């Protein structure tokens, strides 16, 4: 997980985390998805780009970003603080 390893082990990426926040993921699995996204963002250098969308019968971004951002300290911090606010309700639709 160190910066030097993660940068020497793969070329830069354009990640798009896609959370399923439908009703079925409520309870324990949502508490785990929050920590999982927050530990996944922690493996992104400054040359990688990231955006965290969510979907429950309707897909939308999870923060005030609407596109791919540069995954530096502040952007990662905003995405982390915006993931921890999601709640689970609705029907699952993978196509949207």
């Amino acid at each position: 997980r160190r910066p030097w390893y993660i940068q020497g082990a793969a070329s830069p990426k354009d990640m798009l985390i896609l959370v399923d926040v439908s009703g079925s993921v409520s309870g324990l699995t949502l508490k785990l998805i929050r920590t999982s996204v927050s530990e996944m963002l922690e493996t992104l250098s400054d040359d990688d780009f990231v955006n965290v969308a969510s979907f429950n019968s309707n897909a939308q971004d999870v923060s005030c970003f609407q596109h791919l951002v540069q995954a530096n300290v502040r952007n990662k911090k905003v995405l982390k603080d915006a993931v921890n606010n999601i709640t689970a309700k609705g029907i699952t639709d993978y196509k949207k």
């Binding site: 439908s22 409520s26 309700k89 609705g90 029907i91």
Partner: protein, 48 residues
């Protein structure tokens, strides 16, 4: 006076099995099978 005590009973036993395969999901989620049972409930109500 026909075998009517074996059809509505057969339908009640087919309808008490359409309640066991229903799968309840947390806070307003649903899969296909439940959406099909919601239809079949109309058939059962109308037959009764």
């Amino acid at each position: 006076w026909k075998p009517f005590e074996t059809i509505i009973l057969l339908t009640i036993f087919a309808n008490c099995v359409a309640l066991a395969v229903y799968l309840p999901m947390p806070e307003d989620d649903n899969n296909s099978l439940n959406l099909g049972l919601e239809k079949l409930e109309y058939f059962f109500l109308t037959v009764f």
